[PDB]
Amino acid sequence: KIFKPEELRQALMPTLEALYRQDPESLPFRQPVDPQLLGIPDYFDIVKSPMDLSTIKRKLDTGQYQEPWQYVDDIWLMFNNAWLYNRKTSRVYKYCSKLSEVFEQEIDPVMQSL
Ligand SMILES: [Cl-]
């Protein structure tokens, strides 16, 4: 179906809030990564399409997702970036896995309703 932007926003936003409210796990994902500041110059060599919670929120607010799967894809892109760039024993890697689990429980019922 064609999705009215506000209908989408209303359905998806709670799932994004749930991730944002995961403390401390969501902390590393609330703002775009800044390799200059963080002193990790090689970040963009590894991560070709940066994504994060704030960017996803902005796209959601500005009606830039026409369909639910698009939002899901951005969520997974964010996760995959973190798993890719961070060692599997790192804090960020584990935070990422936790967010992944929270998302799964959140998104399933929502997708059905859409
Ligand atoms: Cl949107």
Author numbering: 1047 to 1070, 1071A, 1072 to 1160
Article, verbatim:
Interestingly, most of the 43 BRDs tested were highly sensitive to modifications flanking the Kac mark. Also, WDR9(2) and EP300 exclusively interacted with the triply modified H3 pT3K4acK9ac peptide.
